[PDB]
Amino acid sequence: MRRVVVTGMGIVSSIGSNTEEVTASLREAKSGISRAEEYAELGFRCQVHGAPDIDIESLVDRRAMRFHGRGTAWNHIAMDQAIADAGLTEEEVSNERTGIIMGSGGPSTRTIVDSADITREKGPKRVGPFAVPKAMSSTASATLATFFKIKGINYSISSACATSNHCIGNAYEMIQYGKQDRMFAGGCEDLDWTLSVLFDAMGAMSSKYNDTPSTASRAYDKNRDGFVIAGGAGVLVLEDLETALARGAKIYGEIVGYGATSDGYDMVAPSGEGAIRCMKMALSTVTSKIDYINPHATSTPAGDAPEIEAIRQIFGAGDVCPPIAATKSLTGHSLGATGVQEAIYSLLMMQNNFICESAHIEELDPAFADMPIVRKRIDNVQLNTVLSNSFGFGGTNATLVFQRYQG
Amino acid sequence: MRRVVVTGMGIVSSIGSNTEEVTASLREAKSGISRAEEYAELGFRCQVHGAPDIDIESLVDRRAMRFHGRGTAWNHIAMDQAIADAGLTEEEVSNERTGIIMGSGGPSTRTIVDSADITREKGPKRVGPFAVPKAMSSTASATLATFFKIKGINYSISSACATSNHCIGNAYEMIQYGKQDRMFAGGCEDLDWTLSVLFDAMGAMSSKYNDTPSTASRAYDKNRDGFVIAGGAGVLVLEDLETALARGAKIYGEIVGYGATSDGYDMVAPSGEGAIRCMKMALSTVTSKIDYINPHATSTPAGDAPEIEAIRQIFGAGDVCPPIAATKSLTGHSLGATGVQEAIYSLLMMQNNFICESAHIEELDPAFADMPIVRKRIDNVQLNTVLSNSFGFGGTNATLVFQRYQG
Ligand SMILES: OCc1cc(-c2cccs2)on1
Ligand SMILES: OCc1cc(-c2cccs2)on1
Ligand SMILES: [Cl-]
Ligand SMILES: [Cl-]
Ligand code: NA
Ligand code: NA
Ligand code: NA
Ligand code: NA
Numbered sequence: 001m002r003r004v005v006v007t008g009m010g011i012v013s014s015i016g017s018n019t020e021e022v023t024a025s026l027r028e029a030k031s032g033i034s035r036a037e038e039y040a041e042l043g044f045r046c047q048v049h050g051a052p053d054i055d056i057e058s059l060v061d062r063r064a065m066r067f068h069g070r071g072t073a074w075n076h077i078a079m080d081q082a083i084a085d086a087g088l089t090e091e092e093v094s095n096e097r098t099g100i101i102m103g104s105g106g107p108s109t110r111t112i113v114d115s116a117d118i119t120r121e122k123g124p125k126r127v128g129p130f131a132v133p134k135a136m137s138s139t140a141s142a143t144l145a146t147f148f149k150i151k152g153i154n155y156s157i158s159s160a161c162a163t164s165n166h167c168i169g170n171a172y173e174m175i176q177y178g179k180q181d182r183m184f185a186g187g188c189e190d191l192d193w194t195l196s197v198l199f200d201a202m203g204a205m206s207s208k209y210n211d212t213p214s215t216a217s218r219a220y221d222k223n224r225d226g227f228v229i230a231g232g233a234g235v236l237v238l239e240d241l242e243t244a245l246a247r248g249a250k251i252y253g254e255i256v257g258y259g260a261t262s263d264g265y266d267m268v269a270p271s272g273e274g275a276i277r278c279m280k281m282a283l284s285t286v287t288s289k290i291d292y293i294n295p296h297a298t299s300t301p302a303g304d305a306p307e308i309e310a311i312r313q314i315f316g317a318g319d320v321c322p323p324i325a326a327t328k329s330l331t332g333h334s335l336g337a338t339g340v341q342e343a344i345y346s347l348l349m350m351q352n353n354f355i356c357e358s359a360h361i362e363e364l365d366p367a368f369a370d371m372p373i374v375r376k377r378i379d380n381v382q383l384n385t386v387l388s389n390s391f392g393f394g395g396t397n398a399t400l401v402f403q404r405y406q407g
Numbered sequence: 408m409r410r411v412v413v414t415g416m417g418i419v420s421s422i423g424s425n426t427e428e429v430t431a432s433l434r435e436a437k438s439g440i441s442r443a444e445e446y447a448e449l450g451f452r453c454q455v456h457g458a459p460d461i462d463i464e465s466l467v468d469r470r471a472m473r474f475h476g477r478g479t480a481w482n483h484i485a486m487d488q489a490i491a492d493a494g495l496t497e498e499e500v501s502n503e504r505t506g507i508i509m510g511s512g513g514p515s516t517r518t519i520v521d522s523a524d525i526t527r528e529k530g531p532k533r534v535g536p537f538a539v540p541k542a543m544s545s546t547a548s549a550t551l552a553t554f555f556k557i558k559g560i561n562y563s564i565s566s567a568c569a570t571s572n573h574c575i576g577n578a579y580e581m582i583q584y585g586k587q588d589r590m591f592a593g594g595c596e597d598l599d600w601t602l603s604v605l606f607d608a609m610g611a612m613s614s615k616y617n618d619t620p621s622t623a624s625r626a627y628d629k630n631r632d633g634f635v636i637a638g639g640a641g642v643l644v645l646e647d648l649e650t651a652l653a654r655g656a657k658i659y660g661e662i663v664g665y666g667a668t669s670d671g672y673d674m675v676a677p678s679g680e681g682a683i684r685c686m687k688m689a690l691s692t693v694t695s696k697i698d699y700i701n702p703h704a705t706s707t708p709a710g711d712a713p714e715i716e717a718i719r720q721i722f723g724a725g726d727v728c729p730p731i732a733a734t735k736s737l738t739g740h741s742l743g744a745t746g747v748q749e750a751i752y753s754l755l756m757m758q759n760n761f762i763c764e765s766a767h768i769e770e771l772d773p774a775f776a777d778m779p780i781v782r783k784r785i786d787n788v789q790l791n792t793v794l795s796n797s798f799g800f801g802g803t804n805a806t807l808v809f810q811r812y813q814g
Contacts, residue, residue: 043530067674094671096684106544112516112601113523119604123450127608133674133800135605137513137544137565142801145669151681154669154803155573158544159562166562170577177584194519197526198542201534262552262561264501267474267540274558277503393540394549396561 001176005405007249008086008237009344010078012188014050014230015331018081023348025330026356027377031214032331033228038193039200046205048213050230050332051191064147067133069108071190071336072143075233079144079184082235086249090149098182099153101171102140102235103163105187105336105392109194111135140188140336152180156187158336160392161296163187165339165400168236169258175240183238186340191231195335202268205229206299217333218360219297219304219326220373227298230332234340252347253402256385257282263395270391272306276313278397279389283314286385286401290315290322292355294346294388297326298333307389308368317370322387325374329359339390343400346386350404354379408583412812414656415493415644416751417485419595421457421637422738425488430755432737433763434784438621439738440635445600446607453612455620457637457739458598471554474540476515478597478743479550482640486551486591489642493656497556505589506560508578509547509642510570512594512743512799516601518542547595547743559587563594565743567799568703570594572746572807575643576665582647590645593747598638602742609675612636613706624740625767626704626711626733627780634705637739641747659754660809663792664689670802677798679713683720685804686796690721693792693808697722697729699762701753701795704733705740714796715775724777729794732781736766746797750807753793757811761786 011018014032015025025032036049056065056073059080065073083093092098111134115127133142138156145154153174157166164187171185189195199205206226209216217228244251259281263274275296283290293311297304304326315321327345334341349355355378364373384404391397418425421439422432432439443456463472463480466487472480490500499505518541522534540549545563552561560581564573571594578592596602606612613633616623624635651658666688670681682703690697700718704711711733722728734752741748756762762785771780791811798804 042526045531096668099669104544106542107513109519109523109542112519115605115608116516116520116523116601119449119600124452124604124607127604129609131605132609132611135513135516135602136567136800137511137563138567138570138799138801138803142567142674142799142803145671145803146674146801149671150669151671151684152669153667154801155564155566155569155667156544157562157564160543160545160549162562163545173580173584177580193526194523195542197531197534198522198538200531201522202536202539204539260560260562261503262506262557262559264552264556264558267549267553277558392545392549393543394545394553394561396545396549396552 003241004172004175004238004255005241005244006236006252007239007244008082010081010235011341011344012052012054012074012077012232013331013341014052017054019348023352026345029357029359033213033216035213042193044200045207046200047210048206048216048228049191050228052232066130067143069111069134069139069190071104071188072140075140075188078233078235082237086237094149094151096151097180099180100141100145100150100184101157101167102144103156103158103167103187103336104140104189105158105160105163106195107137107139108134108190110192113194159396160394161335161338162390162392162396162398163336165390165398168400169260169398171238172255172258175238181240181243184235185238186235187336188233189231189335189337196229199229215360217299217329219299219329220358220365220368221361222363222365224299226300228332230334232334232337234337234344251405254405256403257286257401259399261397265395268393269302270306272310274395274397275307275310278399279314282399282401288385290385290387291383292386293322293324294342295324295326296389296391298328305367308371321372323355323372323374325356325358342388346388347402350383350386353381355381410648411579411582411645411662412648412651413643413659414646414651415489417488417642418748418751419459419461419481419484419639420738420748421459424461426755430759433752436764436766440620440623442620449600451607452614453607454617455613455623455635456598457635459639473537474550476518476541476546476597478511478595479547482547482595485640485642489644493644501556501558503558504587506587507548507552507557507591508564508574509551510563510565510574510594510743511547511596512565512567512570513602514544514546515541515597517599520601566803567801568742568745569797569799569803569805570743572797572805575807576667576805578645579662579665582645588647588650591642592645593642594743595640596638596742596744603636606636622767624706624736626706626736627765627772627775628768629770629772631706633707635739637741639741639744641744641751658812661812663810664693664808666806668804672802675800676709677713679717681802681804682714682717685806686721689806689808695792697792697794698790699793700729700731701749702731702733703796703798705735712774715778728779730762730779730781732763732765749795753795754809757790757793760788762788
């Protein structure tokens with residue numbers, strides 16, 4: 001198998017519109033969560049969200065937007081950033097050896113709802129002719145593949161909150177086995193009431209912190225009460241090692257492990273044992289210690305705990321376990337985007353020699369008192385190997401491990 | 408690389424509710440297309456569809472339906488059929504070596520729209536707590552993985568009309584490279600106005616045959632005027648060869664080629680050159696002649712022709728080219744389900760020694776007069792190798808090649 005490295009990154013997040021802004025937010029534990037007035041107007045329990053703050057029309061031209069929903073527009077921006085970061089030529093973007101696996105946990109629900117509404121109000125013609133590529137589940141891959149003239153692999157994986165972890169892992173495999181030499185991998189999610197309501201109706205999102213939105217997402221806090229939804233996008237450029245070296249690429253890290261398993265248990269709640277198998281599969285090809293864990297931890301009563309038990313099973317407790325810091329306490333949960341964004345956060349922490357605080361822990365849940373959950377930012381630390389989990393509804397598990405390239 | 412075989416099949420189609428009914432429909436060129444009264448009531452131009460005729464509540468129990476949209480309910484039925492056909496034990500379904508890649512071109516648009524509507528009419532709580540798994544893009548994998556207790560790989564690929572071809576091809580790869588020994592692969596699509604309208608608004612669906620619905624889908628006919636939408640599902644059980652042989656499996660065929668490429672050209676129209684590269688990639692590992700082509704051909708003016716040119720480029724024209732018969736003339740276009748359904752039709756034709764008519768060609772388009780488009784069913788033919796194309800919006804291409812197992 002060939003070795004595979006990350007040569008460029010792009011991101012649109014609730015905690016920044018590029019990697020520099022995201023880094024600053026991570027350093028400073030600056031929350032991306034705000035009040036969602038619209039949710040209040042619609043009668044939601046949860047009235048908080050993690051909204052990007054970015055001017056799409058300034059960054060994606062009108063014709064380029066014809067087939068974009070908002071989530072895939074953010075993904076286009078992230079793609080542009082990743083291409084610029086990697087320093088790719090047009091030929092390097094568009095060739096038979098270069099593909100795309102780019103996903104979202106859902107398509108544009110707003111397109112779907114607006115189309116249904118206008119059909120009934122004004123007639124089917126008024127849907128217009130450009131809705132399918134926005135509404136289809138492959139929207140993120142189809143739009144970017146077309147616009148960037150991708151010639152190799154082109155499809156989307158979805159797996160709920162595991163989506164963009166699986167996108168990256170499958171892209172990794174493609175390169176490992178010699179089918180492609182370069183891949184754009186990642187994903188996105190729109191932020192829209194028509195999606196958020198589905199989660200509010202299940203009681204899954206935080207509602208006890210509406211009056212202090214910035215602290216509503218609080219993985220590992222005793223009084224956590226559900227996740228905070230977000231939107232955004234991320235892209236990694238992946239290359240086989242020889243390709244990267246020969247062109248003088250930047251190497252943000254090497255992908256050294258990938259796990260993908262299934263709980264076969266409950267639709268909404270994790271089993272724990274599936275996560276253990278997933279992490280072990282990712283670690284089976286890793287020779288170095290893990291220096292930092294970016295957990296799935298979404299700030300839910302039922303979710304944060306089984307993953308901690310899985311981590312304890314593999315790594316132990318206390319100082320011998322890698323430091324754990326839940327970035328979702330700052331960012332919220334961006335669904336399809338979360339895996340790739342967490343890969344980016346982890347790689348940026350590796351680049352900058354720090355581990356962020358696991359934010360908003362006002363009182364640690366005593367169930368986790370034995371674990372090295374990061375209570376204050378750790379500075380001047382050399383991270384060489386980082387692990388990130390993402391687990392999704394339907395019992396779907398994905399883990400990635402990235403390593404600092406030293407030969 | 409390991410060899411990979413198809414050991415079980417299941418299907419819910421506009422042309423039958425199981426493989427026996429589908430076979431009879433193929434033999435007899437019995438159309439699955441009917442009038443869609445609802446489309447007329449809503450003011451659509453297109454008033455035809457390919458609707459399954461199956462009693463879901465008789466085949467999937469109530470608790471089992473909690474997280475199903477209609478499309479994934481059909482997929483559950485197809486999964487049950489495939490498991491029964493393969494003769495698998497519960498242990499063979501549920502183990503770490505057995506996974507699922509199961510997709511849909513979209514999720515349940517009806518869930519999404521009904522939820523938006525009820526939110527505004529009666530409030531967010533009235534969405535109920537079970538909508539997310541229906542509405543998410545990974546619905547087909549999540550629901551089946553959970554219910555069937557799948558422990559290995561679990562995710563969905565989507566790629567518009569290529570969806571379930573890519574699902575099968577990626578599952579094939581998983582087995583080839585030794586990551587899994589058995590996979591359930593395929594996909595589904597609901598049939599619902601909230602999806603169909605998106606295509607009617609683009610002018611993509613047939614509207615000149617509303618008064619003779621059965622003949623509206625007519626690939627290669629001079630007067631074709633757009634596709635006919637359908638819903639349904641299909642599943643293949645795939646196994647590495649040694650696994651299959653050791654358990655006394657039925658072997659419907661061996662997967663011997665898989666192509667996946669990207670046009671990087673237009674969102675809706677194919678380029679042709681991408682299809683050529685895709686077919687060549689599938690054929691690069693195939694040593695025998697192709698005996699039958701199951702084309703993408705959807706009965707569109709702009710789609711049927713570039714694929715025929717791609718076929719001419721690779722195979723030639725006239726008698727030296729494999730016979731071509733477009734099953735979509737009988738079935739319509741079931742979107743996410745179409746790739747796996749066409750694999751099943753092709754395998755059933757192989758099993759039964761016939762090639763179906765390419766139906767509803769009242770006047771062949773003179774542009775295709777040089778090609779071996781099947782005008783009348785061909786009987787008593789031994790098919791050994793069959794090729795099936797599926798191409799999707801966003802320039803996404805997938806081709807599969809299946810071969811009769813003879814050692
Ligand atoms: O298509 C709408 C939709 C999207 C999702 C999810 C995204 C990530 C986890 S579930 O759920 N419903
Ligand atoms: O999510 C709704 C939807 C589904 C699709 C497509 C399915 C297959 C090709 S496009 O387009 N919109
Ligand atoms: Cl369940
Ligand atoms: Cl275009
Ligand atoms: Na190891
Ligand atoms: Na993570
Ligand atoms: Na060949
Ligand atoms: Na086909």
